[PDB]
Amino acid sequence: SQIVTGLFKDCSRETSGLSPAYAPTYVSVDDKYKTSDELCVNLNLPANVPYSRVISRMGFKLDATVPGYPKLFITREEAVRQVRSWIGFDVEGAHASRNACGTNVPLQLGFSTGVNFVVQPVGVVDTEWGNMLTGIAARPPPGEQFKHLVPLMHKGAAWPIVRRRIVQMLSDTLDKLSDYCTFVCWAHGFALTSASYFCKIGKEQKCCMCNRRAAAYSSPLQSYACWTHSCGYDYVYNPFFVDVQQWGYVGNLATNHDRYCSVHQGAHVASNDAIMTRCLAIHSCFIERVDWDIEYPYISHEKKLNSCCRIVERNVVRAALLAGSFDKVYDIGNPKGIPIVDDPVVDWHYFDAQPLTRKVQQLFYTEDMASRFADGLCLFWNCNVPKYPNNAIVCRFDTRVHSEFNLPGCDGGSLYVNKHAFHTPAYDVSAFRDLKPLPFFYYSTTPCEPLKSAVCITACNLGGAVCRKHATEYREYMEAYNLVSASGFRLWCYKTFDIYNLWST
């Protein structure tokens, strides 16, 4: 109506507007042609054709709502629903110079995967016969903060190649995780302006070779494909955008990220900015406010891993309880107080941070309860304490193992997505300085209905023999234990453990 925006600004240095037959808007018409009734007159003065005026792309707003078209600037909760597609996105820019002044073009695009793309300075130029998206003169941002951007003015590549490189990198990253892409930006204005160079939007589409959602668009083929079938595709189709600054953060990105993190220290590079942005988003959604009621669908084998975890636990806890004649057990971290194994007759006590059952008490471990819990064995299954006591069985996830269910997190931690999103703190080997690695072994008391093992605790192997029953049992236990160990879980025990105490049963 009356409020004028900086989008599509005329960045040319010409002192006069355009002819009425050449100007795109009534505002851009030169004032010699206008009249009192908001109409233009066709004067006899000749036009100044040909011309070439640089047009600004700063000020995009993807807030339009059309039926059939999805919402791409998503809110917090649905971004938490789409956490597997989180890709950090930062863009550093160059100012238009020489023929133009008043717009910025992308110079280096950085992603949270640690990848940077250097591009040639390319902008929109409006000419008497239409418009073109071609290279323009640019300059680095003046100041000692952007001295590292000066060489990048002589290292760029053409935009069509960088488009395919971006699509290929996104396909390699997001093939197994999700069918979507969510760009996690810190300041979404320039990021969206740069995303206009390699993103296409529209109605949701199906991949041309399978039933998966299409995430990439090929202009030469005019086709849509998923991440698996996006070879040679040049456009990203329907990406999501998330602005972390709108979540209530004051200050720049560096002081906000450095407040809660110390791992992502690095030199000023757009990929480092993007990594810090995604880390800050992870901290904001899974550490500041946890237990958000969102379940995540399974991908590859999480049900089997869940079964194998209990299979391993019911064997290790039973053996630990049998060895050492420990008659008192504290299961610190049990949410409901359900015991692991009920075959041995020992005293059981339950603690948790947020107990779901009145049988379970509230407890937090800060090493000052080390002498408090000294009369019995301590179970810590998926319980994160900065230091573990000397009398305890511990299972802790190694955050250095990256999988489909283990995304990178904050401050060295990892986002473990197993029907729920848990932020596991960084795996520190000094936390088990009073513990030893638990050796591989199997215990069994079942009756009987080639294999040789020096660690199998069974009356069959105690007599120097074996049968088909235990030859199969030991192998399925090996499969379960492998799956658990290759998933990333590490098991630790008190220092004095050995299987020689288990022959008494």
Partner: protein, 131 residues
């Protein structure tokens, strides 16, 4: 630096057109769903004694038409995106477009939805008589 060109009310739809795979369907769906059409078009003051042809080098409106600048009624010129025409040239820019007086609510939608006749150079269904 620079000189502003477009209102903030239009920036919601042109941005959409800057990102869609096919801009014409996007604009027509935006308008048909109830969105506000494009404004800020270059409308010319004419004596209304013209031949009434669709596209001309000078204003040629009749009493039942209005004359607009060619670049102001082209969606690709408003959104500053690539034209779909042969060799990237615009058939409207630098010329004057005659739009029927009952369709001045959305000149851009009329230019997208209609085409001039190849023989008489009038709008098809709005003045063309080649039957």
């Amino acid at each position: 630096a620079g000189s502003n060109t477009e209102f903030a009310s239009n920036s919601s739809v042109l941005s959409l057109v800057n990102f869609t795979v096919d801009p014409q369907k996007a604009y027509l769906d935006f308008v048909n769903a109830g969105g506000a059409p494009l404004t800020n078009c270059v409308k010319m003051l004419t004596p209304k004694t013209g031949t009434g042809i669709a596209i001309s080098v000078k204003p040629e409106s009749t009493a039942d038409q209005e004359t607009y600048g060619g670049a102001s009624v082209c969606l690709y010129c408003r959104a500053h995106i690539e034209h779909p025409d042969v060799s990237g040239v615009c058939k409207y820019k630098g010329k004057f477009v005659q739009i029927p007086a009952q369709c001045v609510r959305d000149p851009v939608g009329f230019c997208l939805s209609n085409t001039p006749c190849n023989v008489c150079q009038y709008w098809i269904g709005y003045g063309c008589n080649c039957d």
